[PDB]
Write a protein that binds this ligand. Structure first.
Ligand SMILES: C[C@]12CC[C@@H]3c4ccc(O)cc4CC[C@H]3[C@@H]1CC[C@@H]2O
Lengths: 228, 11
């Protein structure tokens, strides 16, 4: 056991490096930029997970299944956080900032953009804090959603409980009423559940784009996509 | 080029 403040500071220092992706958009080139970006981020995501304390003490199978299960949710919550103070824009990366209307370039993606933007808008209205963001991204990894994946399982429960306790502690510092602290926690958790659903949609869409030969999918992103 | 398990195991 770390303190909740020690835990949150470990999550801060775990944060991955930022990545850059690098003609006007076609369906093809937009998906190329987005898939290129996702693949680079995935590399850093594994290193990030390894810095979440306890994560590397889990069985390797659990480590693998946790990342196969949550990687798209983690990409998406990162995106929402980068975008939180810019209504109508998705800040995918520096030099890849997309207006809502640019979803019209890719078949099916505008529905997903709007869901990502609406979720980002709820985080903005909630005034999601830096400390809360760190906790929720870690909770997503550690299977707050409880997707069905003894010692590794017991450890995992401990780790998720610790990050939940830290989020509760962060919320308590806000000084708002106990009733409002409970409602805030429920709202954040129901938002995580929504991100899971957007992730399922995203996965579907990417598998469709791959199938229709709209975009090639290589390497780590291919590996992670092959698991769904 | 580097896979999930290699990324998890190494460094
Ligand atoms: C997976 C998709 C491409 C990669 C996109 C991405 C790429 C990078 C990132 O940090 C977040 C997201 C979320 C939306 C993702 C898209 C949803 C549909 C599309 O296939």
């Amino acid at each position: 056991t770390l303190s909740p403040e020690q835990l949150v500071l470990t999550l801060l220092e775990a944060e991955p490096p930022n990545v850059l992706v690098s003609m006007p958009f076609t369906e093809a080139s937009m998906m190329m930029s987005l898939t290129k970006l996702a693949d680079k981020e995935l590399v850093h995501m594994i290193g990030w997970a390894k810095k979440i304390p306890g994560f590397v003490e889990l069985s390797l199978l659990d480590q693998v299944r946790l990342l196969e299960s949550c990687w798209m949710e983690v990409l998406m919550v990162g995106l929402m956080w980068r975008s939180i103070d810019h209504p109508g824009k998705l800040i995918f990366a520096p030099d890849l900032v997309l207006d809502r209307d640019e979803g019209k370039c890719v078949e099916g993606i505008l529905e997903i953009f709007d869901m990502l933007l609406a979720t980002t808008s709820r985080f903005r209205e909630l005034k999601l804090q830096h400390k809360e963001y760190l906790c929720v991204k870690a909770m997503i990894l550690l299977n707050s959603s409880m997707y069905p994946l003894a010692e590794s399982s017991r450890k995992l429960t401990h780790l998720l409980n610790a990050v939940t306790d830290a989020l509760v502690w962060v919320i308590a510092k806000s000084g708002i009423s106990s009733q409002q602290q409970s409602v805030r926690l429920a709202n954040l958790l129901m938002l995580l559940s929504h991100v899971r659903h957007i992730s399922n949609k995203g996965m579907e869409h990417l598998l469709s784009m791959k199938c229709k030969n709209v975009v090639p999918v290589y390497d780590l992103l291919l590996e992670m996509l092959n698991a769904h | 080029i580097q896979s999930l398990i290699n990324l998890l195991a190494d460094n």
